Amino acid sequence: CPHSDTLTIDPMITDLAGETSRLRAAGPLTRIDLLGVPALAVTGHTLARQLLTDTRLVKDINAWSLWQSGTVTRQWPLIGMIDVDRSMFTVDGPEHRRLRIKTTQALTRRRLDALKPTIERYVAELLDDLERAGADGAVVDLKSVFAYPLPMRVISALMGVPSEDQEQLLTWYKAFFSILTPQDERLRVIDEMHGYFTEMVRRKTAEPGDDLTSALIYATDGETPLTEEEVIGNLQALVAAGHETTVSLILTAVRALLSHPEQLRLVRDGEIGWETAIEETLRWDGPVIHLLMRFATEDIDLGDAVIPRGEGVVMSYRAIGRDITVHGADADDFDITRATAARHISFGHGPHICPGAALARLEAAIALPALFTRFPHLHPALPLDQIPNLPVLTQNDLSHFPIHLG
Numbered sequence: 001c002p003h004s005d006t007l008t009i010d011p012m013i014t015d016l017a018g019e020t021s022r023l024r025a026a027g028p029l030t031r032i033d034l035l036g037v038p039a040l041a042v043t044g045h046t047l048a049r050q051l052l053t054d055t056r057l058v059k060d061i062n063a064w065s066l067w068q069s070g071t072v073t074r075q076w077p078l079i080g081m082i083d084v085d086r087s088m089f090t091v092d093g094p095e096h097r098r099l100r101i102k103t104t105q106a107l108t109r110r111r112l113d114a115l116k117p118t119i120e121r122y123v124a125e126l127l128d129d130l131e132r133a134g135a136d137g138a139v140v141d142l143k144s145v146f147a148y149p150l151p152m153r154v155i156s157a158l159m160g161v162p163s164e165d166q167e168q169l170l171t172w173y174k175a176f177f178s179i180l181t182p183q184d185e186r187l188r189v190i191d192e193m194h195g196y197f198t199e200m201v202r203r204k205t206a207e208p209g210d211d212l213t214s215a216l217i218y219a220t221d222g223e224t225p226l227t228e229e230e231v232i233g234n235l236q237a238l239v240a241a242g243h244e245t246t247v248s249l250i251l252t253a254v255r256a257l258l259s260h261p262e263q264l265r266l267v268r269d270g271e272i273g274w275e276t277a278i279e280e281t282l283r284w285d286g287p288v289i290h291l292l293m294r295f296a297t298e299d300i301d302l303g304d305a306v307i308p309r310g311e312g313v314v315m316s317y318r319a320i321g322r323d324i325t326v327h328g329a330d331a332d333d334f335d336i337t338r339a340t341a342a343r344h345i346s347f348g349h350g351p352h353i354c355p356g357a358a359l360a361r362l363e364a365a366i367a368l369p370a371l372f373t374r375f376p377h378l379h380p381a382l383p384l385d386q387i388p389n390l391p392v393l394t395q396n397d398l399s400h401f402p403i404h405l406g
């Protein structure tokens with residue numbers, strides 16, 4: 001492969017390890033190309049922390065030079081990750097906190113202890129599915145039977161999505177994220193998803209229930225109520241984020257522990273906490289690869305570099321998790337005993353830091369020990385090295401996870 005000053009992100013994810021290494025080497029700020037569209041990539045831990053609190057980088061797409069000039073339009077296959085309805089995801093400044101508060105309040109750890117019985121029930125239900133699927137030593141897809149449905153069940157219970165609509169949502173998201181989806185079909189799926197969530201908020205407005213979507217609609221606290229667009233916007237972000245990332249976290253942790261048996265023993269024998277094994281997974285093999293996208297409202301001088309006004313800036317969180325300056329020379333290794341396991345920023349940093357990190361950590365802390373307690377000899381039916389990524393450029397999405405129960 002020839003040398004180039006712009007690092008093209010392969011949409012097929014054929015060499016993720018090599019790409020992540022090249023990003024780190026060319027960092028901590030590099031030029032990248034996203035399906036023919038240029039941007040900058042932040043690949044250093046320290047510089048990411050600084051820029052994630054810099055008020056001169058905004059989420060609003062109208063600040064993008066290439067959106068203003070009309071050179072990037074809705075035909076860009078990744079536009080559904082950026083040009084979205086108004087929500088906590090797209091707002092900065094004082095307006096942002098108003099759109100986050102009820103969600104952060106609902107997602108505090110102690111508030112989540114009321115949801116913990118539900119998580120435990122779904123984990124138990126889907127392990128029963130695993131037991132039936134894996135009878136007579138048959139090969140079982142851990143993703144389809146267990147890891148893929150569980151987070152959609154949990155987030156649906158929190159937000160109020162009916163049990164009978166979840167398979168359709170999953171089908172829509174798979175099309176939304178896959179780069180093979182024809183662009184005209186992807187934009188219609190986005191419109192169909194918007195339509196569903198719009199009617200869901202109108203149904204919850206007329207008949208509220210014990211869920212967060214009703215709390216966003218009502219529960220004013222004395223401040224200006226959220227607009228219909230804002231409620232729908234937060235609902236869409238929460239379901240999309242709450243499902244996509246957690247499926248990856250569950251699967252990557254199982255793969256990391258099954259490929260490092262000595263470390264799986266440490267958490268099963270109670271010498272290292274399962275929570276620590278989860279943090280090292282987030283640092284080393286976390287759900288987000290690249291986070292689109294931030295835009296400079298003015299020129300940002302970084303000493304020996306300048307982010308021009310209007311430039312798009314991506315947070316390459318996977319490369320950031322392999323930061324050798326922060327984690328040492330063995331940063332590319334999975335090691336749940338490392339002293340910097342919980343110092344990652346895989347949930348982000350600054351105002352837009354993930355509001356559901358406590359829920360993500362709770363789902364994994366329940367599912368993982370329950371899986372290995374139920375199936376103590378679970379092992380891969382396919383070499384773990386050969387499980388491919390789905391063609392989703394921005395997310396760490398595994399295709400299928402063939403196992404034997406043992």
Ligand code: HEM
Nearest residue numbers: 088089237241242245246287291346347348352354356360
């Ligand atoms: C499972 C592991 C998860 C990871 C690794 C993760 C990662 C992230 C990151 C890195 C961001 C912000 C990116 C940035 O602004 O630079 C974010 C935002 C967000 N996440 Fe999480 N997430 C996870 C789980 C969840 C869950 C369970 C939920 C919902 C309960 C959730 C809901 C959200 C929302 C609504 C935002 C947007 C917040 C804002 O922009 O102010 N995520 N997530």
Ligand SMILES: C[C@@]12CCC[C@H]1[C@@H]1CC[C@H]3CC(=O)CC[C@]3(C)[C@H]1CC2
Nearest residue numbers: 080081084089236237240241244245
């Ligand atoms: C990048 C993530 C993982 C962490 C945050 C997620 C996005 C939140 C906003 C919503 C907003 C949407 O209606 C589309 C999906 C989107 C961009 C999420 C995609 C997946």
Ligand SMILES: [Cl-]
Nearest residue numbers: 003004005006
């Ligand atoms: Cl060069």
